Design a protein around this ligand. Structure first.
Ligand SMILES: CC(C)C[C@H](N)P(=O)(O)O
Ligand SMILES: [Zn+2]
Length: 864
């Protein structure tokens, strides 16, 4: 059964009011609903989605004539005017290991409804174009469940003689079912507030365990920053006098934007310097912002159907990116976002599971919360901003909300708003939503007369969903550098400037940059103006010049990235010919200049010193031996480590002094620590024995989690017993902090050491490990699945291990399993031996009785 976008049809029924009543007992919870249903197409049967135990169903107080089949409840004869439906269901939250619907965690109850989890609570028209006004009543034992939360305003509540108490929540904003939330349990609260631009106080309440409460401070501040920023940048104001955030340790995703009651994975809300890295802090800031920004881009305006997921996700990611960029280090953080895209989204677009930003079909919608919908989706939204500028973009946002506030709409509606608000045609831009695959740009430069003539051709490869690909609208931002590396002015188009956005709209175009009175090297795709591969015949010297002198952060970084890529390509060639490694003279020269350049921003310097991942390196390759690519990359890192060993120390000490004992989080101090941790990584592969010196003064250097993690990461591949000891001491010191134990299992799973597989298998039985906890499963098993030398081991042990865990995990959590099985996505691009073994593994997963729809869909894409 496949769902198709082209088959969309408006619902035959609307739900106007949704009154819910929760009776929480041990072990079961009884849900009583009362829906006010309004016919849209009179005469049609009422179809309700649902998978919970059905106890009773009524139409207007009378027992209904119905049939239950699969997860569908049908009532043939329903009135032609407004009527009530009353469904009574029973749930066993403690048995819910899928972490979808109503489930237990840490003795408390939580919900996760997006995309289609609400049907697991009650029978409902569970689709996002059906919006209803919710009133939620909750009854439970007061001692066990003192805190009872749902969307909106608490308007009533009371006590019963027998120890139970109740509450009543009213969400006045019509919403789809996927934004419903309920929380019941014993939780500590952190209180604060934000006053809106119109003088209205908004009560802020963060709910966590008693012990985790001290770690929620940074998240509260980030929210208040996010609330202020949305006002100042977008003119968007919060619309309730209460905003609640709940932390939960068992959670499939990062966080959830349920209206006025966000539910967060602990990893994106808890932090202190002692237990969280600077990266963790930045993560909290991004995600807290993200979930708050959904209140307008997702909740006030929602999705007509789930094919439109990127409408709220691409747009909201773009917003949290701009939020983070406005806070600090925009350039550095832009590179990070670009790096993430090329390292995870590009592989996806090149693989068997490739899909457009707006899919045309899906079997299981949970499989499409992907890098493509999110990150490429953001890049698509960012291109509007590039084409229109900030003011023009905000004009689109204004008209978007003017038209569609309180509606469930599509990506086309967003595009129309951008188009109409600025009086511009964006018909061709629609292809960014419908055409999958990474576009490839072939560029040629020619200076004849006094005009730099830039030819550019685009090509979009076929993908499993679509062969035909038409030319797309691709903004290419460009500049010119002379022999000395200073910006050269040119005329385009009737305007003399130092920078221009060349709009490529067809298969091949030539752009005329006139008024060029000297030799130039072009700077291309500045700021990563479009999500594409660009090929230009740069000399190594051209790259040295761009890296050294160009004014755009990305192009400088990309120039360094290109030199690294070429170096690894050389290593591959020599290792293949059974010959000495290359010398990499021009590369080593560049790295030396980077290391010694005191003018480079510390964090930007760290990025320039990062080598592209194996996935980037074998991009577009056939018959891949992942270990040869691994060997070639490792060889380059060894060369850089050993060659610059004393300067790594020097840079290390420089960073230590500039940090200046400022161990709490700040973008400034974090920049030095990032650079410090790069140096440690290089030092400790050049001189592994240095670990004992580090171990000797561990307590001295373990001044925050950034330092501990940085040190443990640097030594994680060390074959010394000291590596194991430090890991064991780490687990002991932080045994009580679940989020830090995640870091422990990540180190175990990711180690380059020869004995990683058996250490991983021992870790499975660690008292603090739980396969049923998504964070733990990802940390240990996810990391191993990405551990190239071990996952792609020749004997196939990595394949068999991961396949076993996919099978095992899928028995209780298909979402984690479906994510994990995508470690096999490289199947058909592997050399014959490994490909055979991967197919065997995939066949074995497929042969499982009761295999989830989630995993089945993915395995299908790879095998069939
Ligand atoms: C599926 C769900 C929990 C993801 C949220 N919509 P996010 O994209 O805001 O994390
Ligand atoms: Zn989101």
């Amino acid at each position: 059964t496949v769902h198709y976008l082209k088959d969309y049809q408006t619902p035959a029924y609307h739900i106007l009011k949704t009154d819910l009543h929760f009776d929480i007992n041990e072990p079961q919870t009884v849900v009583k609903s009362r829906l006010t249903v309004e016919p849209q197409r009179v005469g049609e049967p009422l179809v309700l989605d649902g998978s919970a135990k059905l106890l009773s169903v009524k139409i207007n107080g009378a027992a209904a004539d119905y049939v239950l089949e699969g997860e569908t409840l049908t009532i043939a004869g329903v009135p032609s005017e407004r009527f009530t439906v009353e469904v009574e269901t029973e749930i066993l939250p403690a048995e819910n290991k899928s972490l979808m619907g109503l489930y237990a965690s840490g003795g408390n109850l939580f919900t996760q409804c997006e995309p289609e989890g609400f049907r697991k609570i009650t029978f409902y028209i569970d689709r996002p174009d059906v919006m209803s006004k919710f009133t939620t009543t909750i009854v439970a034992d007061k001692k066990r469940y003192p805190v009872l939360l749902s969307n909106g305003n608490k308007i009533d509540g009371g006590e019963f003689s027998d120890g139970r108490h109740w509450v009543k929540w009213e969400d006045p904003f019509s919403k789809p079912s996927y934004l419903f939330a309920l929380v019941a349990g014993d939780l500590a609260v952190t209180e604060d507030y934000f006053t809106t631009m119109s003088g209205r106080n908004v009560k802020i309440e963060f709910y966590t365990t008693e012990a985790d409460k001290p770690k929620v401070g940074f998240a509260v501040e980030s929210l208040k920053n996010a609330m202020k920023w949305d006002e100042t940048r977008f003119g968007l104001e919060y619309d309730l006098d209460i905003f609640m955030v709940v932390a939960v340790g068992d959670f499939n995703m990062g966080a959830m934007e349920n209206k006025g009651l966000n539910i967060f994975n602990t990893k994106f809300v808890l932090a202190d310097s002692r237990t969280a890295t600077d990266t963790d802090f930045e993560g909290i800031e991004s995600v807290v912002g993200h979930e708050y920004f959904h209140n307008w881009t997702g909740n006030r305006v929602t999705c007509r159907d789930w094919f439109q997921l990127s409408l709220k996700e691409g747009l909201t990611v773009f917003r949290d990116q701009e939020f983070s960029g406005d806070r600090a280090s925009r350039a550095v953080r832009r590179i990070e976002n670009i790096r993430l895209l090329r390292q995870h989204q590009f592989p996806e677009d090149a693989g068997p599971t490739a899909h457009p930003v707006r899919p045309a079909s899906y079997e299981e919608m949970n499989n499409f919360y992907t890098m493509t919908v999110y990150e490429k989706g953001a890049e698509v939204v960012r291109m509007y901003h590039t084409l229109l500028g900030e003011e023009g973009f905000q004009k689109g946002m204004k008209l978007y909300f003017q038209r569609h506030d309180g509606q469930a709409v599509t990506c086309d509606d967003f595009r129309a708003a951008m188009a109409d608000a600025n009086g511009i045609n964006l018909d061709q831009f629609a292809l960014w939503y419908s055409q999958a695959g990474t576009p490839v740009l072939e560029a040629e430069g020619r200076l004849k007369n006094n005009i730099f003539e830039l030819t550019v051709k685009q090509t979009v490869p076929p993908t499993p969903d679509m062969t035909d690909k038409q030319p797309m609208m691709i903004p290419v931002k460009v500049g010119l550098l002379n022999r000395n590396g200073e910006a050269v002015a040119f005329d385009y188009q009737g305007k003399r400037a130092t920078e221009a956005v060349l709009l490529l709209t067809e298969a091949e175009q030539t752009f005329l940059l006139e008024g060029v009175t000297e030799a130039v090297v072009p700077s291309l795709l500045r700021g990563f103006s479009a999500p594409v591969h660009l090929n230009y015949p740069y000399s190594d010297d051209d790259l040295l010049l761009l890296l050294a002198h160009d004014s755009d952060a990305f192009t400088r970084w990309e120039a360094a990235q290109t030199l690294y890529r070429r170096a690894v390509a050389a290593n591959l060639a020599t290792l293949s010919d059974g010959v000495e490694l290359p010398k990499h003279e021009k590369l080593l020269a560049a790295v030396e200049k980077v290391i010694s350049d005191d003018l480079l921003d510390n964090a930007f310097k760290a990025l320039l010193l990062g080598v592209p991942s194996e996935a980037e390196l074998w991009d577009g390759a056939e018959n891949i031996d992942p270990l040869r690519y691994h060997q070639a990359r490792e060889a380059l890192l060894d060369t850089l480590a050993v060659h610059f060993l004393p300067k790594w120390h020097e840079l290390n000490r420089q960073a230590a002094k500039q940090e200046n004992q400022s161990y709490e989080y700040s973008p400034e101090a974090a920049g030095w620590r990032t650079l410090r941790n790069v140096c440690r990584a290089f030092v400790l592969r050049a001189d592994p024995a240095h670990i004992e010196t580090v171990a000797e003064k561990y307590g001295e250097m373990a001044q925050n989690m950034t330092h501990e993690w940085g040190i443990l990461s640097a030594v994680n591949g060390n074959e010394s017993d000291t590596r194991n000891r430090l890991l064991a001491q780490f687990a002991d010191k932080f045994s009580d902090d679940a989020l830090v134990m995640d870091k422990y299992f990540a180190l175990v799973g990711s180690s380059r050491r020869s004995d990683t597989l058996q250490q991983v298998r021992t870790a499975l039985q660690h008292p603090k490990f739980s396969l049923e906890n998504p964070n733990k499963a990802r940390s240990l098993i996810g990391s191993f699945s990405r551990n190239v030398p071990h996952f792609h081991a020749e004997d196939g042990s990595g394949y068999r291990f991961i396949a076993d865990k996919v099978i095992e995990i899928d028995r209780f959590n298909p979402q984690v399993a479906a994510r994990l099985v995508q470690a096999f996505n490289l199947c058909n691009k592997l050399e014959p031996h490994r490909k055979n073994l991967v197919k065997q593994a995939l066949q074995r997963i497929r042969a499982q009785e009761g295999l989830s729809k989630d995993v089945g869909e993915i395995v299908g894409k790879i095998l069939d």
